[model samples]
Each structure stands twice: as structure tokens, then as C-alpha cells.
Target chain A: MNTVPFTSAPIEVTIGIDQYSFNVKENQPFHGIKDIPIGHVHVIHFQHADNSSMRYGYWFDCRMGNFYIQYDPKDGLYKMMEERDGAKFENIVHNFKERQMMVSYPKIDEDDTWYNLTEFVQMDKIRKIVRKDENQFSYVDSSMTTVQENELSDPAHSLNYTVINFKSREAIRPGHEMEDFLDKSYYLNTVMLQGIFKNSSNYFGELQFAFLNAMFFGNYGSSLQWHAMIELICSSATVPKHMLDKLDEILYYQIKTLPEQYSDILLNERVWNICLYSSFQKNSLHNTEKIMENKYPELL
Target chain B: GAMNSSNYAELFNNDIKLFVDDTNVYRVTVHKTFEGNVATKAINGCIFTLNPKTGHLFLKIIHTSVWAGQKRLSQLAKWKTAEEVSALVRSLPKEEQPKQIIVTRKAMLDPLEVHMLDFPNIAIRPTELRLPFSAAMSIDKLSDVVMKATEPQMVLFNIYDDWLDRISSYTAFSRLTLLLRALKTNEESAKMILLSDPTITIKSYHLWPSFTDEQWITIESQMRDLILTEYGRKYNV
Candidate 1:
């Protein structure tokens, strides 16, 4: 392709691996270059303060290339170059410039240009694209794409071998809750929360043991059993912000479905306890005495 | 119930003495009945003590009420000042002597006046038993509650079975011990318990006002069982 566009000709810009094509029309000299690896590029068309019309196109390769089409008054015509590191020697391959685009200086490296272009493009759009092959299909479309566009984008005409279709199904199994949203933070937060419901004196020791047991045995099921374990832990010894957030969300859900009479009390109690528990140190029993007394200040 | 309507003054006089033992433990000696009467003389003295370790005031009957009621035993421990004490009360100036005296002890009454014991009101009973009560008022509300006097009971009957029911079972003792330890560790368990039961204050050594001989046996057995079950080690006692 010619480096410079002739009248009524299209301008071709090679970004990374892909090349884009566009045209500048009469009166609409302000043409936009888009979907480029870099952000939007404009084909400038404006009158100077002197009322003289000036036209040019601006584009860039995220790698090391900055391409432009500007009117060079010295040449008495529009010119472009493979200018690099201020070495604007014979720039053209076959024109007045020396051969091979630019002499001996390497083209922006494949890996280097690849990384630059990859980083520059819209990543979310790239991730949303689903792939497909013969007899196997994946389906997706952009937010703007039609469902039909999704189908067209994946597979066109393919085999139809389904003899029957029915309602969706799920298999019920015990211990399924284990696979649910169980996290170490959940247990830890639960330990802290249990203390809020009762005086930690009642359950701190049991909870201490249960917390260790949770780390080892991982056995926790019924709510009553949890309370029993907590009481046991309390009977024995003496007794994070995100974990608080998880408790807030979990407790809100718990407080949601129950009766307001009951739920409000739960809410108030939890808020009060959380306020108390928040001031406490985690894990260490002896250290917590200080924080605990701080919550009910007169205890000291 | 028979003594319920009896005038507190008719049964006793103002003789209250507070003292501490060698260990700095505070106690009081009070006349539960008239010393002049020979038949009721055996039940005349009851020891009132505020156990520092347990924090419960013990009004232990030095002798059983059954034995105290026996006339033969009353004569066996003959009172030397029996006639002399009577002459002082009868011969004193009428204006200087008070017309009435409550049967309750000076030990409880002295602290009750000072707001240290913080009882709601005094109830006098014949038998000497531990009257377990709670100090429900928070530190901020202590003065107000005691001054305004809103507590349920400063002293109540030491109903052995009822008191045992409250803390006898494994679960009850377990929770009590847990709270006791929590209270020992300076946790809010004491406040929680006080909220529920106003007739008592928590102590590291005990929860009730004072466990009787039988109740103490029950408590010790529960403690042993608790250690056996929870700690998996036998507490031999």
C-alpha cells in the first residue's frame, strides 16, 4: 500500500497485527478512526485562524511507531515517514527513501508489539467472545449483540440429534452445605458472634475449643450443636473487618425473614453485641479481658 | 408462716455486733430470739458472715431449729446473764428505751443502711440459712438503684430444693461455672446473670449467697462431674 493517500483514496493504518482501512470524504473531513488497539484517532479537518483549510490524519502504534500524514510545504505535497530515533533517512521502501521501509533498524518486535497491542485493546470485549468448532459449540454475544447474533457468531447450520427435552433437574445430597459458602472467616466470625449473643463467660472456652476443632475436624452441622460446642468451649478455658461485613450480610439475611418483634430484638442484640465484640481481640482469651472491660467500662 | 404476722419487736431486741475473723473475713453475731425465755434460748444465737471468697452472706444456724426448740437442751446451756439482761431492759428509762426492735440481724442491717449489701428490704426468718441474693445494679446505676431501692430481694429464703434447682443440674452448673469463670476473667457474664437474677452477686468461688452443707455437697459433686465430662479427667473429690 502507498504510505500516503491520493485524492479519493483510502488511508491504511497498520496498528499491530491487524490493519484498519477508512476514507476521508468531501465536506466531512473530520473522519474518526475507532476500534483501534489504541483509543479513538481523528482525521483532522479544520480551518486555521487565517481561514485556510488544513487536513491531516493522526494514528499511533502502541509499540514504537507514530504515523501521521501532514502537508510538508517543503515537498509542496502531503508526506509521511518511517521516522525513527530522529533518523529520517531514506524512509520509503521503493520511493526516494532507501529500501526495506527503514534501514537495518529492527521493526517493533513481534512479542513487544503483541504485548503493547494486547494491553491497549478493550479487554472485557475480548473476554466476552465465545469460541466454537465443528460438532462442539460455545455461545455468547456482546451486550449490544442480538441472541441471533450470538447463534450466528458461534455455529451456523449444525446437526440436530435431540430426541427429547424436559424440565431442568438438580440432585439432592447430604453434606451439600459443605460445598456452599463456607470459609474460615465464616467460622471465625461465627465464634465472635456467638459471644455477642451471650456473655463470653458462658461460651468463650467452648468456642475456643470448637474453633480449634473446626480447624482440625471441620465438623459443624446443627445450630444447637454449635451452641453446645460453644458452651463447652466456654466451660473449659475462660474464654477482621471483612468477617464483620460477612456477618453483617449474613445476619441481615437472618434478621430479614423472621418476625419483626423477634427480628428487631435480634437486630438490636446483635448490633449491641457486635459493638461489644468489635472491640475485642481475636483468638487470645487473656488479652480480650482488657477489650471486654472497655466495652462495659466499669468492669475494670 | 406462723411467725409471719408476729411483731418483729416482740421476738427480739437491738443487739447487733459486727466483727472479722483472723483471716479478715467479716462476720456478725446476732440474737435471733429472746435470751430471757428458757424454752427458745437454744435458738437464740445465729452467726451472720459475709464470705469474702464466695461473697455470700451466711446466716448459718449454729444449732438446728429442731434441737434449738427442745427445752432440755435450753436448760443444759444455762444462760448466766439471763436475769441481768432482763433487768437492764425493764429498768431503763422509758423515754430512753425504744418501743420496738426488729428480729433481723445487725450484720445485714448495718451494710443495708450503708448501701454496701444493697438489699431491697429485710426479711427475718427463724431458721439460719444462707440467703443468696444478687446485686443487679450496674456501676452507673448502683447508687440510684440502691438509693431508690429497686432491687428484687437483698435477702430471700434459702429454700434448699429451689436453690438446688437453680444451680444443681449439670447444665445449670455448667452454665454457672462458665459464667463464673467468665466473671472471673472480667467478662460481661456477671452483668447477664445479674440481669436475670437480682438476688445475687457473682464471685469467682461461688454463685449463690451461701451453699448449705447439703448444697455444698451437691455443688462439689457437680464440679467433679464437670471436670470429668468436659475436661475428661476425674476430679477425685
Candidate 2:
């Protein structure tokens, strides 16, 4: 494994849907913020000074409505939009404009500037439909249902996400249902998320975020959903002691890193989300229950 | 060991010897001479047959136990009672009754020339030479020469049926005789002599003595030599 020294300068932070601005001090390290308002939409974009280089994107709280602002090295800006009852918010456009600004900045040469080329619409339509009637979300397609199940869910029906690791000029739209991309995304997400959570000081927080993201993105596809559930339940989250005793066995079935041709960061991100979700499940059952009981007696 | 001339003891001392010749035929010979009073015993053992044409031997063990038992039963039937048989045996003249003790020793001999001639190596074609008789005689006399001329050892006859099926029985027998004679005279020369039967119509070496015409012999020899060179040896008499 080649250790890519954090070569780029600190990630440029831009916040808010209108008139957003944030400073990345040379000496200050960026600590992710969490527990924001669930409805608050913020596009966090990180640009590596090198155009051909790769940068990491993360959502501190996906279950709390935090999603990553991802950009591809080859594609210019990613246009993402959110709609609630056929109403589109300006956040998607505003984020696209900000990514464009970064790409067009004369201070950074076009060849060296990291450009945001991926656009994702975090649509509230699905959420609205779920809120209107939980049955809509609960209804599973019989044809897509699988009998062989994992500890969390059936891998055949698990939804997947991508996490960017290596960059390519190819721009991938959310609609492209490619098996190769899905497979590669699953593997990279598993590996990278495992690394992040493994090294995190706040294992519970990381695990919770990963779990929420896994469940959210996993809903997109049955296979990805099942895989996410399995990774969470079968990994160290739901069964910590077992995982500790059999680390190799726990890691054995985790997704593998693939070559650049098959690399997809969105898929990797989904895998990370799943891992975090599983960890949250573990923490909630073990520790969150007590914390929630003390904080909110009604909920407990 | 010294033996007393007792009728009761002599009944148990009888014995017989059997011999087999190289021609693959079995012969029975009896010897009657012993100083002790013992019943005669039949020399019966296994003997295998070898196809002289292909030099392949087959495995067959002959069990003569039944025959030996039959001989004993016959001897017993001749007497009325045990004591009466003893008394009758004691009263007979030494020569008239069976001798002090009858013993049989078996020996194998090579078959005779006449028996060997019964098998001849004839070519399937009219242009082929007639097989020689000496070769047949030699194979017929192998057992005798091996047993008497040489020394007796454990000798087994292995017959290859594949070679036997290709040629006539006469030719097979003749080939065996030739091999045995060749072996007796000269082991090295025997190998070369066996090589004379080629399968070609053209004869180069004077391998076949049966054909008188030089040209005909040449063709036959060529044929025999070709066959022998490819297929080892052929049966000729």
C-alpha cells in the first residue's frame, strides 16, 4: 500500500445553500461537525490541489440527513438536487455553482485544480412517501426477495453506495446500474470504512454514522441492502466479542479493493455507510440505550 | 536306509515317475527298484506348455493327487482283509509278488523325431518351402535332453496361444522342435536359426532347408526371415 502523504492543502470548507463561505487555515485540522438539523442541507466539497489526485468525502451524520458532496477528477461538477412534493431546492444548484467556482479559480491551474464533477440529488420524495405511509417503504418486491439471509438482512437485496478512492476521467451518473461499478464500490467501501472506523477515537460515533449511511443507501438496491446488513451484523458491531475473538473470520468476507478500472467512490461510500450503521446497531444495543434512557425517558 | 522285505511294509513303498518332452506332450514312465518295504508312489506334478512359435509360455499346474489316491484304492481292493492281504503278500514269490518294494521315478524327455514330424511348418502359399524335420525332432526331444543330457531343474512350459492360432498345429510343433535342437546345440546359433522364418515372398538367406529350388528357398527364407525378425520365431518341422 502506498501511503499518499496528505499532499493537498486542507480541504476548502463551504457551508450553507446561499452565500456560503468557510476558511481552511494552513495549521488547523478539519474536525467533522455532527448533530446538525435534520433538514439542514449542506454541501461539503473537498478539492485536492492536484487535478489527477483523489480526495475523501464523508458525511458525519447520514441518518441525520448528512450526505457527501463528491467530485470526480475527470468530470467537472456534480449536479445534485433535492425535491419534496415536486419542489426543488436551490441547494443543489448552489453547490454545483460552488464546485464550478473552485474548478474555474485562476489561482489553481486547470490541470492542477480538483474539480467537482459528480451531481447527486438527495430527493425527499422517497422520505415524503415513507412519512405519508410507512407501508410504502415497508412493501418489498416479492420477486426481489431472497430467502438466504445474513445477520442484518439478505445480501441479495442489500442497497450499495460508492466511496471515492482513485479518480478517473469517466463521469458516472446515479442512474447507471453497472454491476462492475457496484461490485467495485462495495469492495472499496468495505475496506476504506473499516480502516477509518478502526482508527477512529470515537468508535461509536463513526459506527453510528456508518450504520445510518448503510441503511439509507442500502434502500436503493436489495443486493446492496442485504450486503450492508450482513456486513454490519456479521462484522464487529452487532457481535463485538465474537469479532474480536475471530478478527480474521470477520474480515474474511468483507469486500476487497479492486483495480482502478472498477473503482467507484459512491459505491465505496455506501459500504462505509453500511459499516457505520452496523456499528451503531452494536453501540445502541450496548451503550446508546442507557444514554437515551438518561437523556429522554419518553423515548426509552 | 536299509529296509526289511516285509509284505505289509512293501505295500506302502510303491512309487511312479512321469516325464514330459519339449514337444509339449506328457509321457509316463515307471521305475521299479527299491530295497525297502514301502508302497509305490506316483510321480505326479504340474507341467506347463510353451508355444515355440511365439516363445510365450502359459501357466498350468497339474494336480495328480486324485490319481495317486486311485492307485492306492486299487491296491486296497485287491485284498479281502488287512490280515489276509498281508498273509497272501507274504506267501507269494519275491518276483511274482511285487518286489521287496516298488518305486517309480518320473523323467521328462525331448519328443522323438517321428513325434516331432507330426508337426510341420508349411507356408500357406504354394511357393513356400516345406519345413525341415530335424527342427521338429529337436523340439520333441527337449525334455529328454534337458533331463538326461543336461541336469534336472524346475522347468516350466509356457505356451503363447496367439502364435499357436496363426500357424497350423504341425507348424507350431515343428517350430518348438527346431528351437529345442537349436538350444541344445548352440544357444547363440539357436537365436539366429529361429530368425530364418521371415514373412516375405522373397528369400535372401538359406534359412529354409525344406525347399530344394534356390529361388523358391530364397523366397521362402525371405518370408520366414521377415516373420521371425518381426514376430520372433515360427513353429517348423
Candidate 3:
């Protein structure tokens, strides 16, 4: 084994969660805070405009969700439950690099009644302020946006309302439930749309680099699949300026690559047309029934 | 039947002299005479006793040397010809050959036993001879089929009996040697030898399992000591 001598002080990263902060040594065992109640929620603090903002979101799935008691980083509870315990909640931040907020108060259970306050803060953002002083405190705030709908008859407007409602429902669900809900068709489609931002070079070229971090470390296998798909799409020399402009063409390619049994609905020629029309609607959130309706409109 | 009884009674009235020797160390001898044959060829006979214990010979000379002469004869009595000898030899069981024999007096005494000398050669010759004709003659002729058989066939037929007798005698002697060897080692084992005799009463101690070889030698030494202590003479014998 070759030995490399350290010539300078150890590089450190500070990750903040709501009121609490952790001074994490590089490659050191992190001691988690205890006794925060059974269903406590914590906001993962980050800074907007940080290149590592997208990294913070990806790490929320790969690291924070992985560390929660349901996933049970301490006791291997996920393996015990025979299910994945978390998912990447990336759709909340479309241009992940520009839309950094401390996504807060996601409930998790640790013991029967007590939950640990857990978070994944961007190391680069924390380093900026923490470098000035060793023991500096970072402020964490809970900021959220609420959607209110007025009219019901306009289908496209109603679709937007339903999508927002569905996204909030997905975000509020416990990490383990989110993992299960994502197994359904509605959430799988959401996962596809979230991956599109990863391939948008104009949006965040550095954020696109974060997709590799997600692929390498994300909790769900689907996250890695999307990462690979984006990588392939980006690397293609013949790709148009707006490669995803033809959603039908991309969906067609995606469905073609799927297994034969998925061919009927997954490979339906009008899936992109239906997705485009459904994208703005709310109750069209999981349009599995609606997609099938489009396929057999007379039956509907 | 009444006349016969009366005649026997008259014969019983004549005087008769009888003598019997009952010495432990010597051979047993018996002399006897019957009446009404005096001066009529001097009707006489003698019996020479052979000592079973001592192997000594005692002659009861009566009328002729024939009985003494018979003693001089070998245990095996040979005939003038092999045919005659084989006939006698073949009469015995087959297993008795090789170890047992019968030779005539002439063969027994081809060199005479002088009076003052110990005649160790006076003992029996242990071989028998069987000629083809003698062998053929020895077969039981009461069967009509065997009686009608030709010489070649008869010779083959009678040869079996000769071999059987020879083999039988050999077996008997071999068994006797084993018996003597066993008895010589342990006095308790000697009871098996006397078992064939109904008159001999052997005690239970005589049937006990014998000592080991070393133990037997120790026992023999102890007995020798006891004899010398009690009788004031060492029992060298």
C-alpha cells in the first residue's frame, strides 16, 4: 500500500439542519443528535446560486433519506423491512442550481415515538461562511409556497392545480411511503420529468454534473437508470438543441427500450401527446386510467 | 432236554484244578484243565499273559511251547505269502494301517531272543502287507454279485477294505498319541483317558480345568517335594 502524507490541515464541511449544525470531518464517523421526538421534522439548509445546490438535493435522497431510522443507517432496518426506504424529491427544484431552499419539516419516525432530526446541507455553501471562523453559526429558515385554485372548469388550469396537489402529497408522505408511491405509474412519470432538468445544459451544466453524483449514490435504482438515460442523451452529437422538445420521440425511444410486456401502454404512439395535454392538469397527476382512456376513448 | 441236563451233571462231577495269578507287578496268568481227556493226546493248553501296566511278558508253560512261541510273534502276524497276509490285513478297517501291523512269529524272531538278554526286538512289527489275491480274497463273499465278480474286479473291490483298515489303525494310534501327550501334562486331564472305562469312578476334581504350563511345572515340582518329605525318598521317577 502506498502512503500519502498529509501536508496541510484537514478539510472540513459543515451541514446545517434547522437549528442544529454538524461540523463534519472529511472521512470521519458522524455523531447524530438524539431525543428529538418520534415524528420530528428537520429542514435541510442550503444556499441558492451554489453550484453544489443540485448536489445537496441528490444527497437528500442518497444520504439523508438513507440515514433516516426507517432506512435505519444504524440497524439495517430497510433490509429488515425488505423495501427501499427513500427516493429523490428533485421535481420541487426544476433548475436545481438556482432554486435552493432549506426543504424542511419532512416527518420521519426513529423509535416507536422518537424521531431523529436529519438533513443533507450543501458542503460548498456551508464552506463559504464557515471558513471565516471555525465555530460560526448558520441560520436555517422554513419557507414554503402554497398553491390556491379558483376555477374548476378549465381543464388545463385544473391540471396545474392537481399536479401541485399531487407534488405536495408526495413530498409530505414519509420517506418509505414515497418509495412505494414512486413504484406507481403516476410517480414514475414524475420521476421521468425530474430527470429532464438533469440533461438541460443551459439550466445548470454543473447541476448536470450532479446527476453523476445521484447515479452513483441515489437510494433508488430508478434514479440511476434516469442518470444513465440523461448521460446518453447529452453525449449524443446529433441531439437537437431541444432534444426533449419532441417528448413523443424521446418517450418512443424510452418505451422501445422497455421490456416487451410494457409495449402496449408504455409504447402507445400517443403517450407523448397525452402526457403533453395532461402535464398542465392536476387530477391528471396519475393518468394511468386517463392514458388507457385515450387508448380506448369509446370505452371511457 | 431232561437227558441233556443229566449228562451235563455227570460231566460236572469230575475234578478240575484251576490256577490264577493276581500280582500287580507281574502279568496275569490263568491255568485250567478239563476232565476225560487225560492220556488222550494230553489235551493241554496254555495262556501267556502280557502285562498291560508293565509291558512285561510272563509265560505259563503248560503242554507245548506254542503259547510262548505265540508271544514271540510280532503284534502283526505275517503269512507265508503277501496274498495270505493281505487277506488278513484287509479284514481290518482302512484307517488302522501304517500305524498298526501284523507279522508272523518267523518275522518277529528272525533273530532269536536269547534267555539271558533283554529282547527289546521281541515287540511287534508295525507294518502289514497286502497282495492282490489276498486282497481279493478278503472281500465279503456273502453277496451273490461280489462272489460272481471276475479276478480283476475282485482285486479292485477288496483293495478298498485293506486301505480302510490301514487308515483306521493309523487314526487310532494318532488319537492315542494325542491322549498320552495331554495326560502327561496334567493329571486332571488324565481323567479323559479313563472315561471310556465304565468301571473307573473319576471324581469331579479330576475333571477340573488344568493349570497353565508354568503352573503345571510348579505343581509337579511341589508334588516331588511332598513325596520326598513324606517318604524320605526323592521321587526321581
Q: Which number leads on lDDT?
A: 2
Candidate lDDT scores, in order, read 0.28, 0.29, 0.27
TM of each candidate vs. truth = 0.14, 0.15, 0.14
Candidate 1's iRMSD: 32.0
lDDT of 1 by residue, B34-88 (tens): 6564322222222223222122333322223334333443222221111212223
| Residue pairs in candidate 1 whose N, alpha carbon or C atoms collide under 3 angstroms | A205-A233, A205-A234, A206-A232, A206-A233, A206-A234, B133-B199, B133-B200, B134-B199, B134-B200
> Which wins on TM-score, candidate 1 or candidate 3?
1
Which candidate would rank higher by lDDT, 1 or 2?
Answer: 2
When candidate 1 is compared with the true two-chain complex, its DockQ is 0.01
Give the residue spans of candidate 3 off by over 4 A: A1-241, A244-249, A263-270, A273-300, B1-237
Candidate 3 chain A: worst 10 consecutive residues by lDDT? A1-10
TM-score of chain A of each: 0.17, 0.20, 0.19
Task: For residues A109-140, write the lDDT of model 2, one tens digit per residue.
Answer: 34211111001112232232112232211112
Residue ranges of candidate 1 with Cα displaced over 4 Å: A1-245, A256-300, B1-237
Candidate 2 segments whose C-alpha is farther than 4 A from its true place = A1-285, B1-237
